[PDB]
């Protein structure tokens, strides 16, 4: 559970990237818009990190279900005296890649949502409305999708 610090160290990143094009093509005022940016990033980091945990927690078992036979093979190739290696390593063996895919997929999911909203729906809308609706919808919808 204490590993959540990494999730907090990851969920915020993507939330702020679009500021470049917004300042370049939407020409947003970074001073006035900082009020919107801070809230958007904070909410995104909160729910997205929670989603990271949920996805990995919900699916980590499958990793062992698939490859535990191979991991056991290499563990032995290297019953009480034998099982300890299972607790020390095997559980993390499944966990380690489970996290990597969970975060990877979540980040991959986020990008298209903002692209579609900003440059295919909110094309015809105020840059203020463009950023507001695009980012707010992305955060809320993606978090709900993660609960799917």
């Amino acid at each position: 559970a204490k590993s959540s610090a990494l999730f907090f160290g990851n969920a915020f990143i993507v939330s702020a990237i679009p500021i470049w094009l917004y300042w370049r093509i939407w020409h947003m005022d970074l001073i006035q818009s900082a009020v919107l940016y801070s809230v958007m990033t904070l909410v995104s980091t909160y729910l997205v990190a929670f989603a990271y945990k949920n996805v990995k927690f919900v699916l980590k078992h499958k990793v062992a279900q698939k490859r535990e036979d191979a991991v056991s093979k290499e563990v032995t190739r290297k019953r009480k005296e034998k099982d300890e290696r299972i607790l020390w390593k095997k559980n993390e063996v499944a966990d380690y890649e489970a996290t990597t895919f969970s975060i990877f997929y979540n980040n991959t999911l986020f990008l298209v949502v903002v692209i579609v909203a900003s440059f295919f729906i909110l094309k015809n809308f105020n840059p203020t409305v463009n950023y507001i609706l695009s980012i707010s919808a992305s955060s809320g919808l993606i978090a709900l999708l993660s609960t799917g």
Binding site: F101, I115, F120
Partner: protein
């Protein structure tokens, strides 16, 4: 006069010449790349869970 006579126009000196150097004269793609990578990620998820 030379032009009307089809005479050689190069014989007539200009007063001066000036050389004018002429050097000569995305969101869809970003969505596409994100879409394709996400779609293959979905395939990866299916295989991972399959």
């Amino acid at each position: 006069k030379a032009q009307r006579n089809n005479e050689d126009i190069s014989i007539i000196p200009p007063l001066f010449t000036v050389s004018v150097d002429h050097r000569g004269t995305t969101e869809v793609l970003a969505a596409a790349i994100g879409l394709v990578i996400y779609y293959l990620a979905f395939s990866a998820k299916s295989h991972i869970q399959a």
